[PDB]
C-alpha cells in the first residue's frame, strides 16, 4: 500500500544545515506532487514546501522561503527537504506527504524530528520532591533538571511502582536545557511502608541516576 | 490570503456521542476543504476532502458538510480512537496550503477538584546556586486551572513554567505541575512561598505554602 518513510532527523546548531529524505513505496511516486508539513512541539500543522510531479514547480511558506529547498528524485522514489540557516523555531516534527490531486495531503509519512539548538549534550541533575509531614493521599517525586537533548526516561522502583505515577512533559527552559518532574501519589499510610526510588536515564549523555525520595528532616 | 479558524478549541463529549466540529474560512473556498485527524503520538490522516467526500478506508461515521465560508465535521457516534485533534485545510492561489488551528475532542466527565501539593527546593539543589519550587495539581477536571505563585505575599510573573499530562486513561483527569525558578540568593531573601490554585471544582482558591527553613 501507500507508504512514506522519512529519514535524516536529528539535532543541529543554529545557522547550520540539515537534509531530510522521504522514500515512497506502494504507488507511482512520479505521478503526484510531494510536500513537507511540520508541527512544532505542542503546536498545530504548518505546511512548509511543495514540489510538482516532475520538479518543474516549487513553493514554500513565507516562514522558510529563501532558506529551505525541496527537491525530488523520481528514479529513487525520494523527495528531499534541504534546510539551511536553521533557527530554533524550526524545531518540529517534519512530515512528508503525497497527494492525489494537488489540493490535499492524502497520505502522510511517520515524521522526522528536527531539533535546532546551540546547547551541548548534558545529563540531568535529579532532586527529590519530598513529602511534608504537615487528606489521605501524599505526593512525592523527582525533579529532573537541566538536560539536553530529549528524552529522559523515569521509572519508580525499577518499574514495580506504576499506579499513581505522573511523569510530566519536559519544558524547555530559557537556558536551552530541558527539565521535567515525575511524581507519585500514594495512600498516606504508604509513606513509611515502602521505599520510593526514581530511576532516571538519559541515554544521549549515558547518565543514570537513582534517587531515594523520603520525607525531609 | 485565506485564514482558516476552528471552533471550539476543546469539544468535551462522552463516548458514543455525536460530535460537531466547525471550520471557518475568511473568504469563500467553494467546497475545497479537507479534514484531518491526528491521534496522540500519531501522524495526521486524511478524513474528508472536497468538503464532503470520505477518504478511502475512513469509517462511515465521519461526514463533512458546508460550502463557502462555514464547514462542519460530524462524527455520528464517537469511538474511543476518535478522541484526538482535528484540523481543517484549504489551498489558495495554487501555491499556498494552510490549516486551521485544530480542535481537540476530549472525554467529558464530572468536575473534579485538584488536590494541591507544594514542594520546597532540596538542599542538594541550593548547594548548586538555584532554587526550584514545585506546585502539583493532581487529577482534576476540567482542564482550565489557574496557578499563581506568591513570595512573601508578592505575586510572581515570568519566572514559572507549567506542564500538563494528557487525559488519564482511567479517570479521564488531568494533572499539572508549576515550577518556580529563583536564584539561590533571591530564594534566601524571602520566607513564605505560596501556590494559589483556582479551579471550578474548588469553592475558594486553595493555597499551599511553606516557610523557608522550617
Amino acid at each position: 500500500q501507500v507508504q512514506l518513510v522519512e529519514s535524516g532527523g536529528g539535532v543541529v546548531q543554529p545557522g547550520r544545515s540539515l537534509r531530510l529524505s522521504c522514500v515512497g513505496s506502494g504507488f507511482t511516486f512520479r505521478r503526484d506532487a510531494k510536500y513537507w508539513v511540520r508541527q512544532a512541539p505542542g503546536k498545530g500543522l504548518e505546511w512548509v514546501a511543495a514540489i510538482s510531479h516532475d520538479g518543474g514547480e516549487e513553493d514554500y511558506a513565507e516562514s522558510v522561503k529563501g532558506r529551505f529547498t525541496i527537491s525530488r528524485d523520481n528514479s529513487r522514489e525520494t523527495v528531499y527537504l534541504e534546510m539551511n540557516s536553521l533557527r530554533p523555531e524550526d524545531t518540529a516534527v517534519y512530515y512528508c506527504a503525497t497527494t492525489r490531486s494537488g489540493w490535499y495531503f492524502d497520505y502522510w509519512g511517520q515524521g522526522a524530528l528536527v531539533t535546532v539548538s546551540s546547547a551541548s549534550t548534558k545529563g540531568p541533575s535529579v532532586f527529590p520532591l519530598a513529602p511534608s509531614s504537615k487528606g489521605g493521599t501524599a505526593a512525592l517525586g523527582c525533579l529532573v533538571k537541566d538536560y539536553f537533548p530529549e528524552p529522559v526516561t523515569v521509572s519508580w522502583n525499577s518499574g514495580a511502582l506504576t499506579s499513581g505515577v505522573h511523569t510530566f512533559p519536559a519544558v524547555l527552559q530559557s537556558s536551552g536545557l530541558y527539565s521535567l518532574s515525575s511524581v507519585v501519589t500514594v495512600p498516606s499510610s504508604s509513606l513509611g511502608t515502602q521505599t520510593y526510588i526514581c530511576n532516571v536515564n538519559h541515554k544521549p549523555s549515558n547518565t543514570k541516576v537513582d534517587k531515594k525520595v523520603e520525607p525531609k528532616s | 490570503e485565506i485564514v482558516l479558524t476552528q471552533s471550539p478549541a476543546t469539544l468535551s463529549l462522552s463516548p458514543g456521542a455525536r460530535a460537531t466540529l466547525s471550520c471557518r474560512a475568511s473568504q469563500s473556498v467553494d467546497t475545497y476543504l479537507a479534514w484531518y485527524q491526528q491521534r496522540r503520538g500519531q501522524s495526521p490522516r486524511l478524513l474528508i476532502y472536497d468538503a464532503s467526500k470520505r477518504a478511502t478506508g475512513i469509517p462511515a461515521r465521519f461526514s463533512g458538510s458546508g460550502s463557502g465560508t462555514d464547514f462542519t465535521l460530524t462524527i455520528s457516534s464517537l469511538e474511543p480512537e476518535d478522541f484526538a485533534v482535528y484540523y481543517c485545510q484549504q489551498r489558495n492561489n495554487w501555491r499556498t496550503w494552510t490549516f486551521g488551528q485544530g480542535t481537540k475532542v476530549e472525554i467529558n466527565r464530572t468536575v473534579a477538584a485538584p488536590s494541591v501539593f507544594i514542594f520546597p527546593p532540596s538542599d542538594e539543589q541550593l548547594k548548586s546556586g538555584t532554587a526550584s519550587v514545585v506546585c502539583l495539581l493532581n487529577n482534576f477536571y476540567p482542564r482550565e486551572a489557574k496557578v499563581q505563585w506568591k513570595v512573601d505575599n508578592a505575586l510572581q510573573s515570568g519566572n514559572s513554567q507549567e506542564s500538563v499530562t494528557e487525559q488519564d486513561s482511567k479517570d479521564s483527569t488531568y494533572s499539572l505541575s508549576s515550577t518556580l525558578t529563583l536564584s539561590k540568593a533571591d530564594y534566601e531573601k524571602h520566607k513564605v512561598y505560596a501556590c494559589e490554585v483556582t479551579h471550578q471544582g474548588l469553592s475558594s482558591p486553595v493555597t499551599k505554602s511553606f516557610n523557608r527553613g522550617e
Binding site: 512520479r30 503526484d32 510538482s52 516532475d54 514547480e57 497527494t99 492525489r100 | 495554487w94
Partner: peptide
C-alpha cells in the same frame, strides 16, 4: 493549468 496537478 494547475501547476501541482498530477501527471497525465
Amino acid at each position: 493549468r494547475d501547476p501541482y496537478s498530477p501527471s497525465q
